[PDB]
Amino acid sequence: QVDSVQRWMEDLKLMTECECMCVLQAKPISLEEDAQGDLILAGGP
Amino acid sequence: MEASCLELALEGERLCKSGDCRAGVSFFEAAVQVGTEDLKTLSAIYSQLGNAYFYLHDYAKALEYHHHDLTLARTIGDQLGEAKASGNLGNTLKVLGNFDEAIVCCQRHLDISRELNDKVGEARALYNLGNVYHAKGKSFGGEFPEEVRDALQAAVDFYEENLSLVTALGDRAAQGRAFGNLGNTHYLLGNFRDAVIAHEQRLLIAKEFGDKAAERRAYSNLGNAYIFLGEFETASEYYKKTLLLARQLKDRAVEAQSCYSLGNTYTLLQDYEKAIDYHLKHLAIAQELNDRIGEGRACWSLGNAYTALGNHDQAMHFAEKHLEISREVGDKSGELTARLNLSDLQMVLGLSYST
């Protein structure tokens, strides 16, 4: 009985567990060293 | 004492740093209205507005503000400022499907970084270019389109370059992200073994950081790649590990998806008893999260597994459940197949008695 497994493989073929695909960089305003970090790992759609 | 541009700006900044970009946006918007002659600060305002809107999923507005930042950075001659804006504008254009311009923006970021001798910036640009080509590759459409292949190969190239530089800089976490995306790109291309090899490194690195989510992702990607290598037993080992991790991170959805993959894998190994077990665990969680579509998938699978075991009676039950679920969710193909499965099982039974 392959029909159900076939449909499963067809989806699985396009499935990926990606890492951050949208790396944004920040231009801090606050001059404080308390937050001089410029990396934003945002999650695209 | 009407607030100054800088004051409003700093409030928007901390507001966004606290997760509430919807409010930060407001302050940043106001600051622009008040105005300033400090173009370097105005540049940061736009950049942060663009990044905040991006986070809010208002890509059209993220585009507008990143466009503004890029233009201003160029007007005032801020090199690092131009590089950062080019990268941000590129990620936005990528999401919006404008891959040609995204590539140009990200290539711009790469060039300026190399000129400034900004190694980490160079790494960030290579990774962005890799991400853009990866998206481009997935934006098409039994022939595998050459345009999809060229784009994905382009991604592998940039990811490898990023990986090379990032390991030379000793940035372990960035190496992890590089490995994971490199592995997923190979997966989509059909380079399963190299996918496996890259994911093993992603797994390795995730453990070093005690990053459970990353670890779970790696196990899932590994399992999937082994499925397509025809190495089912090996795949099952990895799906079990994702199951444990998922069970451990209290993720019901992912735990269900894991049980479903295990059900299918064991069906491929022709161990229908185990398939039943895992498909049942998936059935339950599906019912729990009230996921009818997946419950249908479950009944469909269970019916097949029981049929493969010779358990006619149990097959009938699930085919019925499948037919029911299929009609309730308006699934045509499923309704018909569940129907065909029911009449066939009824035939098998009725014909099992002499005339």
Swiss-Prot record, chain A:
The chain holds residues 71 to 115 of 579 of the full protein. The lineage of its organism: Eukaryota, Metazoa, Chordata, Craniata, Vertebrata. It comes from Homo sapiens. May function as an adapter linking the Par3 complex to the GPSM1/GPSM2 complex. Involved in spindle orientation during mitosis. May regulate cell proliferation and differentiation in the developing nervous system. May play a role in the asymmetric division of fibroblasts and participate in the process of stratification of the squamous epithelium. It is found in: Cytoplasm; Cytoplasm, Cell cortex. Changing W8A: Abolishes interaction with GPSM2. Isoform 1 is expressed in various tissues with stronger expression in liver, kidney and small intestine. Isoform 2 is abundantly expressed in small intestine and to a lower extent in lung and pancreas. Changing E19R: Strongly reduces interaction with GPSM2. Abolishes interaction with GPSM2 and GPSM1. Residues 4-19 are annotated as: Important for interaction with GPSM2. Interacts with ALS2CR19/PAR3B and F2RL2/PAR3. Interacts with GPSM1/AGS3 and GPSM2/LGN (via TPR repeat region). Identified in a complex with GPSM2 and F2RL2. This is Protein inscuteable homolog.
UniProtKB/Swiss-Prot annotation, chain B:
Ubiquitously expressed. Its main location: cytoplasm. Residues 3-331 are annotated as: Important for interaction with NUMA1. Keywords: Cell cycle, Cell division, Cell membrane, Cytoplasm, Cytoskeleton, Deafness, Membrane, Mitosis, Nucleotide-binding, Phosphoprotein, Repeat, TPR repeat, Transport. GO terms for molecular function: dynein complex binding; G-protein alpha-subunit binding; GDP-dissociation inhibitor activity; identical protein binding; nucleotide binding; protein domain specific binding. One of its GO terms (biological process) is cell division. The keyword Cell membrane applies. TPR repeats lie at residues 5-38, 43-76, 83-116, 123-158, 176-209, 216-249, 256-289, 296-329. It comes from the Eukaryota. The modification Phosphoserine is found at S113, S326. It is found in: Cytoplasm; Cytoplasm, Cell cortex; Cytoplasm, Cytoskeleton, Spindle pole; Lateral cell membrane. GO terms for cellular component: cell cortex; cell cortex region; centrosome; cytoplasm; cytosol; lateral cell cortex; lateral plasma membrane; mitotic spindle pole. The keyword Cell division applies. Interacts with the dynein-dynactin complex; this interaction is inhibited in a PLK1-dependent manner. Part of a spindle orientation complex at least composed of GNAI1, GPSM2 and NUMA1. Interacts with LLGL2. Interacts (via TPR repeat region) with INSC/inscuteable. Interacts (via TPR repeat region) with NUMA1 (via C-terminus); this interaction is direct, inhibited in a PLK1-dependent manner, prevents the binding of NUMA1 with SPAG5 and promotes spindle pole organization. INSC and NUMA1 compete for the same binding site, but INSC has higher affinity and can displace NUMA1 (in vitro). Belongs to the GPSM family. Dysfunction of LGN is associated with the phenotype of multiple micronuclei due to chromosomal mis-segregation and defect in cell division through mis-localization of mitotic spindle regulator protein NUMA1. It is linked to Chudley-McCullough syndrome: An autosomal recessive neurologic disorder characterized by early-onset sensorineural deafness and specific brain anomalies on MRI, including hypoplasia of the corpus callosum, enlarged cysterna magna with mild focal cerebellar dysplasia, and nodular heterotopia. Some patients have hydrocephalus. Psychomotor development is normal. Plays an important role in mitotic spindle pole organization via its interaction with NUMA1. Required for cortical dynein-dynactin complex recruitment during metaphase. Plays a role in metaphase spindle orientation. Also plays an important role in asymmetric cell divisions. Has guanine nucleotide dissociation inhibitor (GDI) activity towards G(i) alpha proteins, such as GNAI1 and GNAI3, and thereby regulates their activity. This is G-protein-signaling modulator 2. It comes from Homo sapiens. The chain holds residues 20 to 381 of 684 of the full protein.
